[PDB]
């Protein structure tokens, strides 16, 4: 057990560090074990400049980014034909959203990715955009282009009345 558990853990952990280093330029993150398996699995992350602290001591946004690194690492261990992500960028800033989006755009050449996000930086990186809307309690779908989707967003931002 602990013979293979370490075979996987070393595989996943190896992934977590390389993904994180991509999402957090100049930074790093390791999945050190508390008992090299009586205890638990701890996460230590260290971005550019800041000191090393367990995930539970990071800011909300940093926690969300680190957690994603972990998740992404588990998916790399056992690649799926497609992925469905619902709001994984709800706490990340425009810069961080973009990094996650570029990573997803990259892996996009090998596996299929279906991400549901309210952020514009995330959708703008997609090959296709599906706009959902509702009228009288009924959901409808329409294939929106990159320009049309942006027009709607720019209109929301204009000062109307």
């Amino acid at each position: 057990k602990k013979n293979v558990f370490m075979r996987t853990f070393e595989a996943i952990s190896r992934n977590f560090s390389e993904i994180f280093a991509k999402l957090s330029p100049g930074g790093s993150a390791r999945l050190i074990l508390e008992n090299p398996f009586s205890g638990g699995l701890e996460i230590e992350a260290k971005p550019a400049g800041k000191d090393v602290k367990r995930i539970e001591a990071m800011s909300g946004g940093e926690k969300a980014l680190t957690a994603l690194a972990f998740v992404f690492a588990i998916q790399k261990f056992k690649p799926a034909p497609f992925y469905l992500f619902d709001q994984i960028d709800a706490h990340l800033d425009d810069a961080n959203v973009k990094r996650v989006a570029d990573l997803i755009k990259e892996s996009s050449k090998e596996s299929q990715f279906i991400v549901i996000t309210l952020r514009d930086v995330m959708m703008a990186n997609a090959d296709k955009i599906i706009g959902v809307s509702m009228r009288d309690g009924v959901s409808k779908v329409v294939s929106l282009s990159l320009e049309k989707a942006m027009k709607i967003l720019e209109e929301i931002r204009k000062k109307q009345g």
Binding site: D86, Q87, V115
Partner: protein
């Protein structure tokens, strides 16, 4: 293989007028106002691939996934979802360019599956999905709120997760 499109009929917020949802082979973004039906599309996928619990699909009973009567529209007689899979590289154990899986649930909670037309059993479907590396244990589906959960986890629960991955 990859998802070509997704047909919904009477499923959650999608009315009786069958709706077709196409996907890019690459990266697809689903956008829309809050409460418009974005997550329900995710629910349709969980459902058609062997939807275990109505809870993960935010439904009291499995029967609540059926379209609820609206303003100018009666309630569905049942909920149906048919996902079309692109089978070119042959990820599945079938000899067919296109693999279609269809699920229907009735007010009584009875569910009928279909594979490329023929009737089938969840177990056969689960097995065809598993052979294509499509499983719940693949963690390829991250639901609204899942990240907030991977956070709350204690170093314990976290160590246990890799247990299952092993």
């Amino acid at each position: 293989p990859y998802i070509e499109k997704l047909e919904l009929k009477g499923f959650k917020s999608y009315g009786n007028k069958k709706v077709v949802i196409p996907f890019s082979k690459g990266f697809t973004a689903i956008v829309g106002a809050n409460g418009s039906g974005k997550s329900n599309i995710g629910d349709a996928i969980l459902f058609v691939l062997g939807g275990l619990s109505a809870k993960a699909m935010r439904a009291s009973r499995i029967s609540d996934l059926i379209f609820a009567g609206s303003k100018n529209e009666p309630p569905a007689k049942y909920a149906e979802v048919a996902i079309y899979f692109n089978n070119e590289d042959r990820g599945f154990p079938i000899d067919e360019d296109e693999v279609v899986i269809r699920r229907r649930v009735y007010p009584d909670g009875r569910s009928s599956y279909w594979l490329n037309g023929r009737r089938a059993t969840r177990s056969e479907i689960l097995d065809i999905l598993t052979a294509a590396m499509i499983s719940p244990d693949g963690y390829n589906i991250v639901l609204q709120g899942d990240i907030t959960k991977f956070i709350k986890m204690s170093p314990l629960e976290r160590r246990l997760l890799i247990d299952d991955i092993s």
